[PDB]
Amino acid sequence: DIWPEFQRDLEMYRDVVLSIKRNLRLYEECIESLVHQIGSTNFDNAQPLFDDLFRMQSELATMLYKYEYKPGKRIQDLIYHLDRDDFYSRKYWHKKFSDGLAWPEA
Amino acid sequence: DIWPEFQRDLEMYRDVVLSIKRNLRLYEECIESLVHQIGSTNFDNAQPLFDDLFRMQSELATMLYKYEYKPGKRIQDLIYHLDRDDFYSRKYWHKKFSDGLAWPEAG
Amino acid sequence: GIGKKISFDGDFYTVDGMKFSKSYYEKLWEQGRPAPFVQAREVLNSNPKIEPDPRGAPGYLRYEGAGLEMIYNPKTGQVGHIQPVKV
Amino acid sequence: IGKKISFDGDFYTVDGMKFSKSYYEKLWEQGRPAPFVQAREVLNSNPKIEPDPRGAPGYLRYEGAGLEMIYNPKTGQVGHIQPVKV
Amino acid sequence: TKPHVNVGTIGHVDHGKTTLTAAITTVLAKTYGG
Amino acid sequence: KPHVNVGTIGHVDHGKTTLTAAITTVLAKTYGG
Amino acid sequence: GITINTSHVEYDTPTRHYAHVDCPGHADYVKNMITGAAQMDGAILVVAATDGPMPQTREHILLGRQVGVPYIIVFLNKCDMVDDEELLELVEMEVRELLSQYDFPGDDTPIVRGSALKALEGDAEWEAKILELAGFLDSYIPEPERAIDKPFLLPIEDVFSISGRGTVVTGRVERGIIKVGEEVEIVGIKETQKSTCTGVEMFRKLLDEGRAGENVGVLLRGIKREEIERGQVLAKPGTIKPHTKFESEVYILSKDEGGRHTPFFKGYRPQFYFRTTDVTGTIELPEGVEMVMPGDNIKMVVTLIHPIAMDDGLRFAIREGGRTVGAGVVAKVLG
Amino acid sequence: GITINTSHVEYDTPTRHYAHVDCPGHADYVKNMITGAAQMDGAILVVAATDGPMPQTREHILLGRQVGVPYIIVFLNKCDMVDDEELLELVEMEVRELLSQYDFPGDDTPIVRGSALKALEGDAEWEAKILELAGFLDSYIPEPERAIDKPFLLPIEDVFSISGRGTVVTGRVERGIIKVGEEVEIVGIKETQKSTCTGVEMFRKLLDEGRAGENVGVLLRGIKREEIERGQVLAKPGTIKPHTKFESEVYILSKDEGGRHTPFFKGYRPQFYFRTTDVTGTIELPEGVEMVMPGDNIKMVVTLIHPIAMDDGLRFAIREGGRTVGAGVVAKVLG
Ligand SMILES: Nc1nc2c(ncn2[C@@H]2O[C@H](COP(=O)(O)OP(=O)(O)O)[C@@H](O)[C@H]2O)c(=O)[nH]1
Ligand SMILES: Nc1nc2c(ncn2[C@@H]2O[C@H](COP(=O)(O)OP(=O)(O)O)[C@@H](O)[C@H]2O)c(=O)[nH]1
């Protein structure tokens, strides 16, 4: 009869998922704002902002691959598009965000 | 910076999901066997077996609706098809399982 | 409009011409399917598709609407079973 | 059989492939283990090969085995590798 | 049904909080039959 | 050199803590002292 | 588990029934004011006329305002020990000064000159003074406002979606009444939203109305499942607001009470549990205080990472790893 | 957190280097034999010739066989106190009888008649006896089998799926060597399965081979993500089997060690953690024993609800709600 321990696990599942989704909302908001800032400044001054942006993506990628939490499509698309972090991807994203791109798209 | 507590939650998520899936495998196996037994016995002697079968479905329904764990399609179909528990649904399922139905499926 | 009392006669909970058995009523709240009278009313007010009970329980019909399927006796007002439609 | 992975302070290298120190460690750390195994799968999958869309010099985009990789066929460096978009 | 009210005693040590708590319940009992 | 993990067991006051000290003292003095 | 040692005495004036709660230790009074068994609807300050006010008379009065003890009556005690009237008049002046600092109307505060001991021994002259006090208990302290009389509030426990109509949210009503057709706000965590109840059920009792007490399901038209979550509240519009920052009065559990072993410092990031959910927050210790020892009470400023519907007086628990490490009350909301 | 107080002494014979682990308390010896920092490759039983064997000399010897201490040497001590040879010959006869009961070959067990105190004080006659003992340490105790020499075993931590090629499983190799092309079994929880490694990587070190020690990723052809899970093991085929039932030696944590407050009884359903995952199991207490107090050692039969790859000697933790409440070793697999 596994139900009593199963219920305990299920309650834990409900609570942790609730919490993760909330955290995801904060990542989403913070990223929308970094994208906005990056698009409003010059390339040199954007570098520490990109460092924060990619650091966040890296954590969201760890969530997806290490812990296997599959997030909403928006965050999934973000994890893909912003995975590559170098001079050449930064040049590309800076340009796109400066021209008014609000969230990473292809 | 929420990452440290976020990681803790994520690790807890990974562990609990792992455990729930295992429990789901046991429910699945136990139900396959009850269905088999019910289909191999007469209606009267099947009643306590049906009581166990629907009790399990009820718990799986609680999982879906109260705690919002969405299981694999097989268990989802089972939760739907076996939700109704009365004399008339038992008569229907007994017949189908006796004719060789191994898992609840649409007519 | 205003508050309508739910009556309990030992066997059923009744209100607005609907009724649920004691145990089924309690089971629905307990399993995370609250407000069964509200659910059943939604079905009744959804221009539901009405057919005979496929299992053949006497007096009962199958009603479908508002995202739910219900087995309901229009003579007694008893909701015998109600759940969301198949995904 | 066993081929040693060499480390020169800056890169990990083996079988004509290489990864920067930090990128290599990042992949294991993030739950994307065995980056040489992943990259070899790409190289052996008859991959679709195109110029790097971002224009990094020497680099090409390779796609196969469920993954996309940015790779320099002259240096052997895997600059970036990830699963294809869902 | 009579009105219910929750009260309490506060103040510094040895000032008579435990004494007053006892004195109140004794007097009202004697007077009003509480 | 070959590594080996050993330990002392037995009842109270029988000399487990003493023997542990005695072993390390003697071998030190004898072999490579 | 926290441990609170209290004495419950019960007495009756001719009009009202009183439940009196006195505590042996200074530490127990604090534990009780912050995490009451019951909330004090009024308090009896006891000042000796021998000593006048002292260090703890200030502490309890301040706690009163922080906790939200609504009214305070003074029983100037040990008056059998002191003869002169003038000396008393002076002490009463100090006690009113004190109460006035912490926003209790000191000028308008009742003050009974009595002897509790002589009264308990059965001395008619001083017994009158006890009866005078219980007069001020009857007159100065109003009956507290009953739950059902307030603005409507439902903490959300569970959410059940019905396709094409809305979402049903459940929980136990905290105060007030909800009727079908009323507008409600959904407050906390997310940006506030409004909606209309198109159905209510109060478990085993009522259809289309719900009353403080038993569980209620509320059907909100046009609200989809992902737009509401556990830990939010339903409220009559404009009666509760979400906040992230607040001043608190907090009691930190001792180790023996199941709490922390070591003190914490200014970078403590615990979970704060309000009603139906826990939320991470950071803290600001008061000036000079570097650490908080297990077993201490203290005043702290909290900043939550997600807003919570709250008002002054709202109780909360402080948690680490699933264990309760403290208990608090919202003193003053900040923003 | 468990607490084990030990003394770690290190000495060298001319051929071998020894790491010696003694403990102050009886309770510490038990704690160490079950959850030792290191596994004893042989033990030194100490019996006084003054007292002969005693209650705990039996306990330690039995624990030896249960834990899997392979060889035992005797140092019959305090011989400076006893004059008579005949009396000693009698004690040695008892000690060999004792060892023989718990399946240690008592007849050809080495037994050194010595004085540890006289030896430590620097008395040449009794120092020889210490050197005799360390002769038997060199001769009677073989070098244990090194990890890398055994059959291959990898507990699975994580799984990463690659489309069209297979699944990569990671973990830290426990023993043995895995090379590309070798067949492997996946054991535990589910019905056993076989597969072939089509790729290996040992973190920072090797491609297509992996060695006990650092983390390894193993690509299994044809294994899909849902067919493997954390907590299973990869193993050389036919070298490890799944089991649900086993005899254990277990130490239950005290309350002060972070464990239980109250004893448990025969219907205890805790979680048992093996290598990388915890699985629920039921227990059978031994004859007469109705309860187990926090702080006790006990021998118990466990029945898991899901099979786990295991062999005798496998250590495990006992958990309740996420907290460690005990530690154990698999004494005897049953089926
Ligand atoms: N003379 C005199 N002594 C008093 C009076 N009230 C309290 N005391 C004394 O104060 C002492 C301690 O008071 P107590 O009830 O413990 O106050 P608490 O410390 O606040 O609980 C008792 O031993 C009493 O004798 C009073 O009205 N007159
Ligand atoms: N005569 C004699 N006494 C000993 C010897 N070894 C230990 N003792 C006595 O045993 C006491 C405690 O011994 P100890 O090493 O703590 O034994 P343990 O309890 O097994 O650790 C000491 O005070 C000694 O007097 C020995 O070889 N000869």
From Swiss-Prot, chain E:
Residues the entry annotates as binding GTP: G11, H12, V13, D14, H15, G16, K17, T18
Region (G1): 11-18
Domain of life: Bacteria
Subcellular location: Cytoplasm
Residues involved in Mg(2+) binding: T18
Subunit architecture: Monomer.
UniProt family annotation: Belongs to the TRAFAC class translation factor GTPase superfamily. Classic translation factor GTPase family. EF-Tu/EF-1A subfamily.
Function: GTP hydrolase that promotes the GTP-dependent binding of aminoacyl-tRNA to the A-site of ribosomes during protein biosynthesis.
Protein name: Elongation factor Tu 1
Organism: Escherichia coli O139:H28 (strain E24377A / ETEC)
Lineage: Bacteria, Pseudomonadati, Pseudomonadota, Gammaproteobacteria, Enterobacterales
